[PDB]
Write a protein that binds this ligand. Structure first.
Ligand SMILES: NC(=O)c1ccc[n+]([C@@H]2O[C@H](COP(=O)([O-])OP(=O)(O)OC[C@H]3O[C@@H](n4cnc5c(N)ncnc54)[C@H](OP(=O)(O)O)[C@@H]3O)[C@@H](O)[C@H]2O)c1
Length: 314
């Protein structure tokens, strides 16, 4: 099987990718920054867990070109799950990949919306521009790539939008962004990870934009809430944050506090995750692997009720 190295492997979505890679029998590696006295105990725990699972951990800084090239010459696929503050640093990955010359595929840290076909409010557009610059650098180096639009991380957004708790109360306030009829897609993290590993090894997805849009996971905030209320057995106080308020906040709030509201405006008001139809060269992943299936929204919510869903995260 193809050998896979993951940057940001100890991250929120990164850890799912590492486990999926191993589960699909791929020799797995991660390039990680050296630990420090302030390293969160969580980051320390994950590295120990990964090592015990057979993951090869290469410790180093992004600026260590020779170290990165040496490792990349030993693998076939590179997947980056680095966070926004580290997006620009991916240029070092691109340079090490080109120097190595043996890499079959590079998946930059996209995993969101399809940045090349949307234009959100200034605060969000600014961060998206960093990801676009990485894409332009990939194209300039002529590297084999796959740009993944994973759409909404399932557990991440259910926690954010519904904040499930042991004992819900009528007054545990539910916020609806915009009017709530805008369609978006919610995909469970474990599935996003599994499909990403398959996609990275699939020749059909080389040098292509791949979108995770399983038909059963397309939903509006109002539909999601109705489903959640039916399952939770109670009616929540629902409040709206209309388009105008989100726009106003994106302009009046300081940075980076103005980014969250800008992202919510893009996803739930402009509907940038469903305001476009699949293109010719565009690939929808749920149609690719008969052996795989995206967990339905109903299934994702049951995961939360059963108390087996990922915990809240920043
Ligand atoms: N579609 C969606 O709903 C959605 C939601 C959230 C995120 N995303 C996207 O998914 C991607 C990853 O997001 P995420 O939330 O998973 O990221 P995250 O959890 O914040 O990633 C942090 C990870 O990178 C490392 N790291 C952090 N700061 C670093 C630094 N200064 N130098 C070196 N390594 C550093 C960490 O290693 P340590 O263990 O050493 O700390 C950790 O592995 C991004 O492209 C993001 O935009 C999409």
């Amino acid at each position: 099987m193809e050998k896979i190295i993951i940057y940001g492997g100890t991250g929120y979505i990164g850890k799912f990718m590492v486990r999926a890679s191993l589960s699909f029998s791929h020799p797995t590696f991660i390039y990680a920054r050296p630990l420090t006295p302030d390293s969160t105990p969580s980051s320390v725990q994950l590295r120990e867990e990964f090592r015990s699972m057979g993951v090869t951990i290469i410790e180093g800084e992004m600026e260590e070109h020779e170290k990165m090239v040496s490792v990349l010459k030993q693998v076939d696929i590179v997947i980056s799950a680095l966070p926004f503050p580290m997006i620009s640093s991916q240029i070092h990955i691109i340079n090490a990949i080109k120097a190595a010359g043996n890499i079959k595929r590079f998946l930059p840290s996209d995993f969101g919306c399809e940045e090349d076909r949307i234009k959100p409010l200034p605060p969000f557009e600014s961060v998206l521009e960093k990801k676009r610059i990485i894409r332009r650098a990939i194209e300039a180096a002529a590297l084999p790539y796959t740009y993944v639009s994973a759409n909404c991380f399932g557990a991440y957004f259910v926690n954010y939008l519904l904040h499930p708790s042991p004992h819900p109360n009528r007054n545990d306030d539910i916020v609806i962004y915009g009017t709530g009829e805008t369609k978006f897609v919610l995909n469970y993290e474990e599935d996003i990870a599994k499909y990403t590993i398959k996609v990275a090894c699939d020749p059909r997805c080389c040098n292509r934009i791949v979108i995770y849009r399983p038909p059963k996971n397309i939903i509006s905030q109002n539909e999601l809430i109705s489903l959640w209320e039916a399952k939770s057995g109670l009616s929540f106080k629902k409040v709206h944050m209309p388009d105008e308020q989100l726009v106003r906040l994106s302009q009046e709030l300081p940075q980076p506090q103005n980014i969250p509201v800008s992202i919510l405006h893009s996803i739930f008001v402009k509907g940038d995750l469903m305001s476009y139809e699949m293109r010719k060269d565009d690939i929808e992943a749920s149609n690719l692997y008969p052996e795989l299936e995206f967990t339905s929204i109903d299934g994702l919510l049951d995961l939360f009720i059963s108390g087996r869903a990922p915990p809240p995260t920043l």
